[PDB]
Structure 1
Amino acid sequence: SGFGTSYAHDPKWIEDWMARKRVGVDRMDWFFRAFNRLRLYELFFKSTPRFYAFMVIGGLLGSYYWSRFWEQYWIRVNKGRLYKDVPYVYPP
């Protein structure tokens, strides 16, 4: 309360919010536990030359299939309005 004055102070519900520290709670540990089983760190990240290769080879493959995915998205959205979708009929 006191919003907009020199008496402004945090309301009660903000104080309660900051009283919830979630000490000793980890609801996302499953994600990291399962991610670690991919062994990406042991195989690629730990060694600098392999870390570079991951960025290069990943960027190569990632860039190609990223382009491929959105090209299909474009073709679906503009279905029936593309030059390839409407073969031209020559006048007689």
Structure 2
Amino acid sequence: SGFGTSYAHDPKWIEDWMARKRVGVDRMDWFFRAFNRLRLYELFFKSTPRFYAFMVIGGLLGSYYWSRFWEQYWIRVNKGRLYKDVPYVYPP
């Protein structure tokens, strides 16, 4: 309360919010365990030359397929309105 004055103070709900520290709780650990079973750290990240190779090779293949995906997205949104989708009929 006291919003907009020199008496402004945190409301009770903001104070209750900050009383929930969630100490000891870890609800997203499952994701890290599962990611660690991919062995990306032991195989690529740990060694600098291999980390560089992951960024390069992963950026080569990622860039190509990202383009591929968004090309298909475009071909679908604009179906029937693209030059390839409407062969031209020559006048007689």
The alpha carbon displacement at 1:35 in A equals: 0.3
User: Once the two structures are superposed, what CA deviation does each residue of 1:25-73 show, in whole Å capped at 9, x if it has no partner?
Assistant: 0000000000000000000000000000000000000000000000000
Q: Report the aligned-residue RMSD.
A: 0.1
Q: Distance in 2 between matches of 1:55 and 1:29?
A: 26
The alpha carbon displacement at 1:85 in A equals: 0.2
- Give the aligned length: 92
- Unaligned 5+ segments in structure 2 are none
Structure 1 runs, 4 residues or longer, greater than 2 Å off: none
- Unaligned 5+ segments in structure 1 are none
TM, length-normalised to structure 2: 1.00
> Percent of pairs identical after alignment?
100
